[PDB]
Amino acid sequence: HPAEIVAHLQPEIWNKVNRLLVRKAISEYAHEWLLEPQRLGPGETPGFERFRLTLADGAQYDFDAQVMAMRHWRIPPESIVKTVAGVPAPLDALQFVIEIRDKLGLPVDRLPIYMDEITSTLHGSAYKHGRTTLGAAALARADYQTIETSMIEGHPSFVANNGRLGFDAEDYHGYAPEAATPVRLMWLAVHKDNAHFSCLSDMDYDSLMSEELGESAVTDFAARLREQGLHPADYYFMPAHPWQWFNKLSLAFAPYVAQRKIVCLGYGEEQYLAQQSIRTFFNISRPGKRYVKTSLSILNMGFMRGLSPYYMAGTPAINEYIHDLISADPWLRANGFRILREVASMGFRNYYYEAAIDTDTPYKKMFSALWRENPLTLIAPGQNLMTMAALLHVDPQGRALLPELIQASGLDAGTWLERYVDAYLTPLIHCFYAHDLVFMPHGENVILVIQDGVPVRAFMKDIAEESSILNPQVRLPQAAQRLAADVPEAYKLLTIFVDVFEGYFRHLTQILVETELMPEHDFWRLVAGRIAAYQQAHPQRLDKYRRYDLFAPDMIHSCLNRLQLANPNLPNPIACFRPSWL
Amino acid sequence: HPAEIVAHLQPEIWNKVNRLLVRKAISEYAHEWLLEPQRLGPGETPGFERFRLTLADGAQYDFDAQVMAMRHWRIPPESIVKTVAGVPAPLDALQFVIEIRDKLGLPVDRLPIYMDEITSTLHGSAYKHGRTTLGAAALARADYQTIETSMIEGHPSFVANNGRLGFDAEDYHGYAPEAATPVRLMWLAVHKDNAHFSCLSDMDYDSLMSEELGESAVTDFAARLREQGLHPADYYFMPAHPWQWFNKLSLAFAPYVAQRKIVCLGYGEEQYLAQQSIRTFFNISRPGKRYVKTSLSILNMGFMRGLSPYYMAGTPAINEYIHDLISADPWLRANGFRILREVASMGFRNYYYEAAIDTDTPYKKMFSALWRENPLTLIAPGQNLMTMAALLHVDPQGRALLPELIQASGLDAGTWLERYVDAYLTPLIHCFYAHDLVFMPHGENVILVIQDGVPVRAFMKDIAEESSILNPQVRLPQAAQRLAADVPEAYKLLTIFVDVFEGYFRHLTQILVETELMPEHDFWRLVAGRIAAYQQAHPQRLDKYRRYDLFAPDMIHSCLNRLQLANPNLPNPIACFRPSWL
Ligand SMILES: Nc1ncnc2c1ncn2[C@@H]1O[C@H](COP(=O)(O)OP(=O)(O)OP(=O)(O)O)[C@@H](O)[C@H]1O
Ligand SMILES: Nc1ncnc2c1ncn2[C@@H]1O[C@H](COP(=O)(O)OP(=O)(O)OP(=O)(O)O)[C@@H](O)[C@H]1O
Ligand SMILES: [Mg+2]
Ligand SMILES: [Mg+2]
Ligand SMILES: [Mg+2]
Ligand SMILES: [Mg+2]
């Protein structure tokens, strides 16, 4: 029945998730100064103030808030009360966006798209809150992929973060990460005139295919090419997201299909689960196998999710460089921090789009793939992996995962958080100061290695797209040259201030305070302490600690929601712990 | 197998259809002055000249052409020869568009979309040329729906005319008109707060539903609402294109589904065929039933194919007005020309999009429907119906339908064409002069009534969207007020010059000449003769014949392809037959 496809859309659960998204919208938009709530007096929850939002058409939102560090608006969702001209009304996230549309500054051309992203985020939220779920306590001790597929929030700062625009109602149940439906990849023969292969210096295409597909499947694919009168030597075998084949490649790449530059070989035998990034897949049929990342022409969280052939060309070289650098560094060796290498890549160039468009465009990015190192092969017996996003997880009953994980560990909050900070933040600090090396260290890019509830180290993924060496003097292999970047002095610490402090820790301390684990100031003292101890241990780079000052009175900050909608100072929470040598 | 979905994409058929689309591109772009072919000398076909297109990157296209009336480039497809820097290359329609991209003036933002429309037009062409088809001779005598689903060309002027962007590979085989796959409508209960119903003054919702669904199905739908604790009196029942439910309504209208303002009742029992407009459906389960036209959010030929709730409100009133006008006119009564009434309509207003966007937008147009009068109920026993597009039909073997139809009729070309002109053009002339009433009279809007191969009269559809009364002094019911329009004096004859002469007859005379039925000048003499005889018979409107001069030296003309790509004089082929009274 066509109705079953949205059976998760029911009035009561819809109201629940709209209330939660209005809370996030009020909090994040206020943080970015899109909203300026008016203080009414003490709030209806102890330690909170009562705030009001008055809109020009008679809508009024009253709520409780605590303004924490970095202008962070901590709001209890049940405290929010909407009245339209004095009459109480249900919280409606889409109405809220419309009511503040003058303040948002969306182009009238882009507003309906933003609205659809909000609606789709809500529909997913309804599905996620209504599905069979593990509670916080069980999830804290679950296996890697169970944790991965059980995440609810998405990116903690972006309001319209889970749109997946392009997935129809049936696509959702087959391909959305939270649906946890096994997926088989589509395999295609691609002509070498269009497809470019790259890999690590000690790998080749044959060895990759031998590990990934196996000789039997490879043999069959080649024999199927010969059978239809083609030369296997003229082709590589390349995986695609099945949605991408049906929706994009079969149609938009029709001339290549017709000319047999692309030949559809059908579904692989092995099954995968879509990861939180949607277009990346973990193999659930066999152990030790690489993730497969694919081009997927859906709009999610600011971007179409294709994969660039130009980027693919240098991806393995960039990863090899960074891996070697990390492996040769004795501080990093002792810490355990490391990357998951994008070991091989395939880019299919569409010369029609390339001839037509000189500029950067998603149209060039519809058909690429890469293979990423499996982290389970890197850890000790008994250890387990969890997406760092899990530390922010709150289950549909309102129970936080973090205190459960800390309880399970047997350690005090302080000791646990010190271990976490030295596993996650300190290596980022070291990579910055010692190597000018920066990543994108948000919850979906960081995998924590957990030992009896305790983070013992961290893995970073999403390397070649996001990483930079901030020193044009670095000597790189030609293929890896785009890694080198040069950023103004004022913005060098962007990845720590914006991506770690504002993008992740800001949300973490709300959880810490709500669950009574730790006051925000204690957390920031601890963070400052780890930074200062690192700097003390490596005094020879004082020039850099002074020039790029983590203890500056004000921090770099970004307005992520403003940036998405488009296409003052923020005091630094560790400034008061500034060490003497600065 | 995922490969079967594009089994129609094979090298040889791909080359065939690309050659045909390059012919159309060269002809239409040249007609609009986007191209200016250089004459080399006499052509390689008798009566043709040889022309060259030189592009700045070494591509050269030589071809034979005859420049007919209205700067019409008649080109034999096999005469076209592409050389890239002296080396012969296959004709590739997408490459051709790219090669002339400087001349087209596409925004760099809109070019990739245009390219996709070209590619999808080609993929459809490949399917259409490769499918099981009737030959021209059989099609000339086939039933209405067989003719409808067997059309190949599409709009004869637009190069990128059959994109259907949004239909994936599987959607194509289920929903494209040429796939001729029976479709069942999706039925939804829609809340009266959002859904507005309109119909003819002597109809009501209950009688419409009684005729269309029947009491049994209506009863069941209402009982299903009550069963789930809703009041049937709060809802109408409304049909949708199933693609629209899965891709747009279930997701983008999620808040309404969640709030139960939209309730999916499932597929209807009756089966339909998609007409050439894609979103309009003819009932193939029962006789006498109305067409159902639906909102479908795909991009085709310049426009997203939704259906406006604002337009729906006055649609039946506009149709009732025009029908009554035609019925009261004794000239039209004697001729037989008439409209197929859009008798009832339903518009679902999405108040989120309406609150957010003040301007005209496709987002407001995603959920509407109307019902259109069935023409089979209006004709005599033994007569048959055919889309006027059929007169331009050429089968995959290169055989034209028109000479077969004329041969079947027993009449000479001249006599046959005189009957056709008096069935089609003369009533348009009368409607203009006597009533200031204009339509959009292209091949897909006109249905010919055929009697033993002879057109005896014509039906016009697509009324409320396209028609105007060009006289603000007309007294209309309030609901029908938007019918009245006021156009500058110089552009009043647009619908005849642009839509009939340039848009349809221009293509017709190529067929007439190619098939040796009639020289173009004989055709234009005949047309002029029908016009002059009409004017002679109604001398009292001479003021209007002088003011809006069908015999002016130059005609109104439009560059349709330029207009689509964006978002000199053209001599009038009947100017030399100007009657004495002008
Ligand atoms: N907690 C989270 N933090 C950040 N992004 C998240 C989170 N949960 C889900 N996501 C989604 O993951 C994607 C992150 O974007 P990013 O560019 O980092 O990854 P990617 O390049 O798409 O894939 P991968 O990380 O597999 O290489 C976005 O689609 C985002 O919406
Ligand atoms: N020979 C043809 N002439 C004009 N349009 C055609 C032809 N064949 C197919 N079409 C398609 O039919 C549609 C014509 O557009 P138009 O606005 O006249 O109709 P509509 O409002 O979509 O539907 P209907 O005519 O059913 O009311 C376009 O999608 C066009 O591509
Ligand atoms: Mg990532
Ligand atoms: Mg990335
Ligand atoms: Mg029409
Ligand atoms: Mg129309």
Side-chain angles (χ1 to χ4, degrees):
Chain A
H1 202 279
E4 276 303 293
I5 218 69
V6 286
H8 62 280
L9 301 181
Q10 300 290 132
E12 293 310 299
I13 188 86
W14 187 252
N15 275 4
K16 181 193 176 186
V17 299
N18 273 261
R19 171 170 293 270
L20 293 163
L21 193 65
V22 170
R23 185 276 292 266
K24 185 171 174 182
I26 293 168
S27 174
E28 292 302 306
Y29 293 156
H31 167 73
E32 299 182 23
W33 296 88
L34 287 166
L35 305 171
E36 294 185 56
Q38 182 57 252
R39 182 182 179 275
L40 296 176
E44 306 189 0
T45 318
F48 287 74
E49 313 305 311
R50 196 80 178 154
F51 290 94
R52 170 167 297 167
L53 289 174
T54 298
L55 314 168
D57 275 15
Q60 175 189 104
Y61 292 79
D62 286 0
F63 57 100
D64 286 350
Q66 269 197 353
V67 185
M68 300 174 66
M70 300 177 280
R71 192 186 160 80
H72 182 70
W73 291 77
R74 175 190 173 207
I75 302 163
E78 293 302 336
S79 80
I80 307 167
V81 179
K82 179 180 177 170
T83 50
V84 182
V87 182
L91 291 191
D92 183 323
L94 191 56
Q95 257 172 19
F96 181 65
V97 168
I98 295 160
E99 286 156 5
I100 72 168
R101 76 199 190 274
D102 266 27
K103 301 190 168 78
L104 290 176
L106 271 154
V108 196
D109 208 6
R110 166 78 159 100
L111 172 62
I113 293 172
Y114 190 76
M115 284 171 68
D116 283 2
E117 293 192 84
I118 292 286
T119 300
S120 175
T121 294
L122 287 165
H123 120 72
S125 188
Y127 179 90
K128 288 187 286 197
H129 279 264
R131 58 158 259 206
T132 285
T133 60
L134 287 66
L139 204 54
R141 72 209 207 207
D143 69 274
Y144 175 42
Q145 286 299 297
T146 296
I147 295 175
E148 187 76 13
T149 59
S150 296
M151 296 298 89
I152 288 177
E153 182 63 28
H155 193 298
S157 308
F158 286 97
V159 175
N161 65 348
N162 304 327
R164 296 86 162 266
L165 301 194
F167 275 177
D168 73 20
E170 304 193 324
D171 295 333
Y172 182 82
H173 294 284
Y175 303 131
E178 59 266 33
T181 300
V183 177
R184 305 159 74 204
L185 296 171
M186 192 66 62
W187 281 95
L188 303 119
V190 290
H191 202 284
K192 297 183 173 179
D193 286 350
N194 299 81
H196 178 255
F197 180 70
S198 311
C199 66
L200 301 184
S201 68
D202 60 333
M203 275 175 50
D204 57 23
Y205 171 81
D206 283 339
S207 67
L208 177 70
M209 287 304 103
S210 185
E211 283 179 306
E212 286 298 311
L213 274 166
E215 181 195 21
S216 167
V218 167
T219 290
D220 283 337
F221 282 171
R224 293 170 61 189
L225 293 184
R226 308 199 106 110
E227 191 279 333
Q228 67 181 269
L230 298 171
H231 300 141
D234 287 339
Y235 294 85
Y236 291 120
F237 308 127
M238 172 172 195
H241 196 299
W243 186 98
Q244 194 76 350
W245 168 248
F246 289 108
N247 291 266
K248 296 297 170 177
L249 310 173
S250 58
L251 304 168
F253 287 52
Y256 293 128
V257 177
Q259 297 160 20
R260 308 203 287 168
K261 297 307 189 201
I262 296 169
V263 178
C264 183
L265 296 160
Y267 288 107
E269 306 259 12
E270 307 204 341
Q271 296 191 113
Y272 293 81
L273 288 176
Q275 304 300 269
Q276 280 305 308
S277 58
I278 310 142
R279 63 165 161 186
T280 294
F281 291 95
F282 182 84
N283 194 316
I284 57 157
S285 279
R286 293 188 164 180
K289 298 260 179 145
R290 294 165 173 113
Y291 302 88
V292 179
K293 178 166 182 180
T294 64
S295 49
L296 182 60
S297 299
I298 61 165
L299 183 71
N300 200 60
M301 209 189 74
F303 296 94
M304 298 280 290
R305 298 295 167 163
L307 193 59
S308 165
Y310 166 62
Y311 275 43
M312 291 310 93
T315 285
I318 286 169
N319 280 255
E320 194 165 353
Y321 183 82
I322 296 176
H323 185 66
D324 283 346
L325 182 158
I326 294 169
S327 299
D329 184 318
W331 189 94
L332 290 165
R333 280 208 303 274
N335 174 276
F337 177 85
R338 57 158 296 170
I339 68 165
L340 296 184
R341 290 169 285 179
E342 295 136 7
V343 300
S345 68
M346 193 79 75
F348 183 107
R349 296 174 69 161
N350 185 315
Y351 303 119
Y352 296 105
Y353 292 133
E354 288 190 9
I357 309 152
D358 269 305
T359 178
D360 201 16
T361 169
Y363 285 89
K364 291 167 182 186
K365 307 189 187 181
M366 294 163 49
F367 196 11
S368 300
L370 63 74
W371 289 263
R372 177 181 286 146
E373 194 165 16
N374 188 330
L376 289 172
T377 67
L378 308 174
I379 66 167
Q383 293 181 336
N384 57 288
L385 299 181
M386 66 164 64
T387 177
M388 195 180 67
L391 307 193
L392 299 183
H393 183 77
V394 173
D395 71 16
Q397 292 69 47
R399 301 173 295 215
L401 184 152
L402 181 58
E404 297 302 341
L405 185 58
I406 298 178
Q407 175 187 302
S409 76
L411 303 173
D412 299 328
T415 308
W416 190 101
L417 282 157
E418 279 178 57
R419 294 294 313 264
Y420 160 65
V421 173
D422 275 323
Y424 164 58
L425 176 64
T426 312
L428 299 171
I429 300 308
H430 175 79
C431 280
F432 179 88
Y433 287 117
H435 302 291
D436 299 312
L437 171 61
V438 297
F439 305 100
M440 169 58 75
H442 62 43
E444 181 272 337
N445 282 346
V446 180
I447 300 175
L448 307 169
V449 179
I450 302 297
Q451 179 129 57
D452 308 318
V454 188
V456 294
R457 61 170 178 161
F459 298 148
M460 181 69 71
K461 59 199 173 73
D462 203 0
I463 300 306
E465 203 184 344
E466 314 294 345
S467 306
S468 299
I469 285 175
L470 305 180
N471 182 1
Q473 275 59 71
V474 67
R475 298 286 177 83
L476 296 162
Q478 194 174 345
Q481 188 54 238
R482 74 166 171 91
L483 177 57
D486 33 5
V487 161
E489 289 213 339
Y491 320 127
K492 288 262 211 317
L493 284 174
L494 203 147
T495 60
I496 306 295
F497 281 141
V498 170
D499 304 323
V500 185
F501 287 16
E502 184 183 26
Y504 193 84
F505 283 173
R506 185 166 58 91
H507 305 288
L508 191 67
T509 60
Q510 181 168 340
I511 300 289
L512 292 172
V513 174
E514 258 152 21
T515 64
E516 302 175 64
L517 287 165
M518 171 156 295
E520 73 170 332
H521 197 252
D522 279 9
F523 173 83
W524 288 112
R525 187 188 293 113
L526 183 158
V527 167
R530 302 290 72 202
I531 295 173
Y534 171 85
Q535 291 189 348
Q536 151 276 325
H538 302 80
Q540 70 282 356
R541 296 199 185 88
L542 182 62
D543 44 307
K544 218 147 164 192
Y545 311 150
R546 292 167 61 208
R547 186 187 294 284
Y548 310 112
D549 191 355
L550 280 168
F551 294 96
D554 301 298
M555 64 185 289
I556 313 315
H557 62 108
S558 178
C559 295
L560 303 184
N561 293 284
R562 280 192 195 264
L563 292 170
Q564 180 181 23
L565 296 151
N567 197 348
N569 65 300
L570 197 66
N572 172 10
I574 68 177
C576 68
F577 308 105
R578 177 189 272 257
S580 48
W581 55 85
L582 295 182
Chain B
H1 202 279
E4 276 303 293
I5 218 69
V6 286
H8 62 280
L9 301 181
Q10 300 290 132
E12 293 310 299
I13 188 86
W14 187 252
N15 275 4
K16 181 193 176 186
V17 299
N18 273 261
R19 171 170 293 270
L20 293 163
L21 193 65
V22 170
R23 185 276 292 266
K24 185 171 174 182
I26 293 168
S27 174
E28 292 302 306
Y29 293 156
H31 167 73
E32 299 182 23
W33 296 88
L34 287 166
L35 305 171
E36 294 185 56
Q38 182 57 252
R39 182 182 179 275
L40 296 176
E44 306 189 0
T45 318
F48 287 74
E49 313 305 311
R50 196 80 178 154
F51 290 94
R52 170 167 297 167
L53 289 174
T54 298
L55 314 168
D57 275 15
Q60 175 189 104
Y61 292 79
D62 286 0
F63 57 100
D64 286 350
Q66 269 197 353
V67 185
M68 300 174 66
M70 300 177 280
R71 192 186 160 80
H72 182 70
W73 291 77
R74 175 190 173 207
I75 302 163
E78 293 302 336
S79 80
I80 307 167
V81 179
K82 179 180 177 170
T83 50
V84 182
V87 182
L91 291 191
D92 183 323
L94 191 56
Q95 257 172 19
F96 181 65
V97 168
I98 295 160
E99 286 156 5
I100 72 168
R101 76 199 190 274
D102 266 27
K103 301 190 168 78
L104 290 176
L106 271 154
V108 196
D109 208 6
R110 166 78 159 100
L111 172 62
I113 293 172
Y114 190 76
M115 284 171 68
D116 283 2
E117 293 192 84
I118 292 286
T119 300
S120 175
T121 294
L122 287 165
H123 120 72
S125 188
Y127 179 90
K128 288 187 286 197
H129 279 264
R131 58 158 259 206
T132 285
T133 60
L134 287 66
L139 204 54
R141 72 209 207 207
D143 69 274
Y144 175 42
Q145 286 299 297
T146 296
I147 295 175
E148 187 76 13
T149 59
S150 296
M151 296 298 89
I152 288 177
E153 182 63 28
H155 193 298
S157 308
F158 286 97
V159 175
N161 65 348
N162 304 327
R164 296 86 162 266
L165 301 194
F167 275 177
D168 73 20
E170 304 193 324
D171 295 333
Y172 182 82
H173 294 284
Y175 303 131
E178 59 266 33
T181 300
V183 177
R184 305 159 74 204
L185 296 171
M186 192 66 62
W187 281 95
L188 303 119
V190 290
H191 202 284
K192 297 183 173 179
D193 286 350
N194 299 81
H196 178 255
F197 180 70
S198 311
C199 66
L200 301 184
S201 68
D202 60 333
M203 275 175 50
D204 57 23
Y205 171 81
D206 283 339
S207 67
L208 177 70
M209 287 304 103
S210 185
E211 283 179 306
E212 286 298 311
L213 274 166
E215 181 195 21
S216 167
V218 167
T219 290
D220 283 337
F221 282 171
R224 293 170 61 189
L225 293 184
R226 308 199 106 110
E227 191 279 333
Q228 67 181 269
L230 298 171
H231 300 141
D234 287 339
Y235 294 85
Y236 291 120
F237 308 127
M238 172 172 195
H241 196 299
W243 186 98
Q244 194 76 350
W245 168 248
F246 289 108
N247 291 266
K248 296 297 170 177
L249 310 173
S250 58
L251 304 168
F253 287 52
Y256 293 128
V257 177
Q259 297 160 20
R260 308 203 287 168
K261 297 307 189 201
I262 296 169
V263 178
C264 183
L265 296 160
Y267 288 107
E269 306 259 12
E270 307 204 341
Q271 296 191 113
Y272 293 81
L273 288 176
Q275 304 300 269
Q276 280 305 308
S277 58
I278 310 142
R279 63 165 161 186
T280 294
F281 291 95
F282 182 84
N283 194 316
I284 57 157
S285 279
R286 293 188 164 180
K289 298 260 179 145
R290 294 165 173 113
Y291 302 88
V292 179
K293 178 166 182 180
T294 64
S295 49
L296 182 60
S297 299
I298 61 165
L299 183 71
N300 200 60
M301 209 189 74
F303 296 94
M304 298 280 290
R305 298 295 167 163
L307 193 59
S308 165
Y310 166 62
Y311 275 43
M312 291 310 93
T315 285
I318 286 169
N319 280 255
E320 194 165 353
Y321 183 82
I322 296 176
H323 185 66
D324 283 346
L325 182 158
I326 294 169
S327 299
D329 184 318
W331 189 94
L332 290 165
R333 280 208 303 274
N335 174 276
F337 177 85
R338 57 158 296 170
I339 68 165
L340 296 184
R341 290 169 285 179
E342 295 136 7
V343 300
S345 68
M346 193 79 75
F348 183 107
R349 296 174 69 161
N350 185 315
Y351 303 119
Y352 296 105
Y353 292 133
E354 288 190 9
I357 309 152
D358 269 305
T359 178
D360 201 16
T361 169
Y363 285 89
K364 291 167 182 186
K365 307 189 187 181
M366 294 163 49
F367 196 11
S368 300
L370 63 74
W371 289 263
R372 177 181 286 146
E373 194 165 16
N374 188 330
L376 289 172
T377 67
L378 308 174
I379 66 167
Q383 293 181 336
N384 57 288
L385 299 181
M386 66 164 64
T387 177
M388 195 180 67
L391 307 193
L392 299 183
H393 183 77
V394 173
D395 71 16
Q397 292 69 47
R399 301 173 295 215
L401 184 152
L402 181 58
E404 297 302 341
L405 185 58
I406 298 178
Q407 175 187 302
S409 76
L411 303 173
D412 299 328
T415 308
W416 190 101
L417 282 157
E418 279 178 57
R419 294 294 313 264
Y420 160 65
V421 173
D422 275 323
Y424 164 58
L425 176 64
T426 312
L428 299 171
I429 300 308
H430 175 79
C431 280
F432 179 88
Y433 287 117
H435 302 291
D436 299 312
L437 171 61
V438 297
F439 305 100
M440 169 58 75
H442 62 43
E444 181 272 337
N445 282 346
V446 180
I447 300 175
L448 307 169
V449 179
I450 302 297
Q451 179 129 57
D452 308 318
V454 188
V456 294
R457 61 170 178 161
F459 298 148
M460 181 69 71
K461 59 199 173 73
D462 203 0
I463 300 306
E465 203 184 344
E466 314 294 345
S467 306
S468 299
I469 285 175
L470 305 180
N471 182 1
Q473 275 59 71
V474 67
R475 298 286 177 83
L476 296 162
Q478 194 174 345
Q481 188 54 238
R482 74 166 171 91
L483 177 57
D486 33 5
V487 161
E489 289 213 339
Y491 320 127
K492 288 262 211 317
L493 284 174
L494 203 147
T495 60
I496 306 295
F497 281 141
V498 170
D499 304 323
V500 185
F501 287 16
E502 184 183 26
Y504 193 84
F505 283 173
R506 185 166 58 91
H507 305 288
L508 191 67
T509 60
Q510 181 168 340
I511 300 289
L512 292 173
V513 174
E514 258 152 21
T515 64
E516 302 175 64
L517 287 165
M518 171 156 295
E520 73 170 332
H521 197 252
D522 279 9
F523 173 83
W524 288 112
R525 187 188 293 113
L526 183 158
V527 167
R530 302 290 72 202
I531 295 173
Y534 171 85
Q535 291 189 348
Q536 151 276 325
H538 302 80
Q540 70 282 356
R541 296 199 185 88
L542 182 62
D543 44 307
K544 218 147 164 192
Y545 311 150
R546 292 167 61 208
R547 186 187 294 284
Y548 310 112
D549 191 355
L550 280 168
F551 294 96
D554 301 298
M555 64 185 289
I556 313 315
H557 62 108
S558 178
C559 295
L560 303 184
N561 293 284
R562 280 192 195 264
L563 292 170
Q564 180 181 23
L565 296 151
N567 197 348
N569 65 300
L570 197 66
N572 172 10
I574 68 177
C576 68
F577 308 105
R578 177 189 272 257
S580 48
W581 55 85
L582 295 182

